[PDB]
């Protein structure tokens, strides 16, 4: 179902990011700040080997904890293997490198109950064009919850 | 901003309904089952005087409570006055009476922070055409959360 980006240069996604919008196939995955896949991406750090370190924050033990996820390169381009969040795959759908990035996470064992997708942006501002790209990519996908954040929320993102 | 239905026959909306989809301007209004405006419409009972009794269920005191809301007719058609859920207005946007109904609730004091909208259906089944009408009506509105329920969830709707 999912169509991944072709000709992705992973080195060009490095730097600071913000989670502008999130979507998921199951409401329980994103509803409430303490939900399993409610994650806020803060930085993408690609490696020389072609892997992707994802820095993000997540609600745990009563507060916003900082997590580092190592996404390993696989034989399929724009698809990375992870062992976190009960997910095993990160899929980069699209990016223009300097404004927005669209990606999804899933578990290959049950991809319909585990699919979460995000729209990332470089600056803590609403990019209507990025949201349009996000919505278009989501049309084919069976999403039952969609969240969209404003500039004020994008500053600290996760907060007690 | 909101455009209400013209030529609404309120008597024809009587009977059983299900909340298929919900949307709101603020995430806090709908995120989590215990959220202030997470409400599940079960029945619409119009009166001979032209008022609308809304039967719905809402999470309160650890369980799904049953609520009856009286929507009073106002001088503007398809717009009803209420005194519940911290809202004071019910706006009927569109309906075909026998399959779907779209409505919004708001507080006139702060309509941007209080707007919640729903897509109702007669039967506990996903109507892709009703969702299309819902999405089109929402385009102009500043929604930051969207929820969509499946047939299994639509049977009991709210549940412990
Ligand atoms: Zn590696
Ligand atoms: Zn589905
Ligand atoms: Zn009356
Ligand atoms: Zn807004």
Curated annotation (Swiss-Prot), chains A, B:
Q: In which tissues is it expressed?
A: Synthesized in mammary gland and secreted in milk.
Work out whether the entry's keyword set contains Cytoplasm: no
Q: Which InterPro entries match?
A: Blactoglobulin, Calycin, Lipocalin, Lipocalin_CS, Lipocln_cytosolic_FA-bd_dom
Kindly provide the PTM information from the record: Alternate disulfide bonds occur in equal amounts in all variants examined.
Location of this chain's protein in the cell: Secreted
Q: Which coarse location class describes where this protein primarily resides?
A: secreted
Q: Which GO terms describe its molecular function?
A: identical protein binding; long-chain fatty acid binding; retinol binding
Q: Which UniProt keywords apply?
A: Allergen, Disulfide bond, Milk protein, Retinol-binding, Secreted, Signal, Transport
Q: Is Secreted set as a keyword in this record?
A: yes
List cellular component terms (GO).
Answer: extracellular region
Q: What does this protein do?
A: Primary component of whey, it binds retinol and is probably involved in the transport of that molecule.
**UniProt xrefs under PANTHER family:** GLYCODELIN, LIPOCALIN
Q: Which family does it belong to?
A: Belongs to the calycin superfamily. Lipocalin family.
Subunit: Under physiological conditions beta-lactoglobulin exists as an equilibrium mixture of monomeric and dimeric forms. Interaction with LMBR1L which mediates the endocytosis of LGB has been observed in PubMed:17991420, but not in PubMed:23964685.
Protein name as annotated: Beta-lactoglobulin
| Protein's organism | Bos taurus (Bovine)
Recorded name of the encoding gene: LGB
């Amino acid at each position: 179902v999912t169509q991944t980006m072709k000709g992705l240069d992973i080195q060009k996604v490095a730097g600071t990011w913000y989670s502008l919008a999130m979507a998921a196939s199951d409401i329980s995955l994103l509803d409430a700040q303490s939900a399993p896949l409610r994650v806020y991406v803060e930085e993408l750090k690609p490696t020389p080997e072609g892997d992707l370190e994802i820095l993000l924050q997540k609600w745990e033990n009563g507060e916003c904890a900082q997590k580092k996820i190592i996404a390993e390169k696989t034989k399929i381009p724009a698809v990375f293997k992870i062992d976190a969040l009960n997910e095993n795959k990160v899929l980069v759908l699209d990016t223009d490198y300097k404004k927005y990035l669209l990606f999804c996470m899933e578990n290959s064992a049950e991809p319909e109950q585990s699919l979460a997708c995000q729209c990332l942006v470089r600056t803590p501002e609403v990019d209507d064009e990025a949201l349009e790209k996000f919505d278009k990519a989501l049309k084919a996908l069976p999403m039952h919850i969609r969240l969209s954040f404003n500039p004020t929320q994008l500053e600290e993102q996760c907060h007690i």
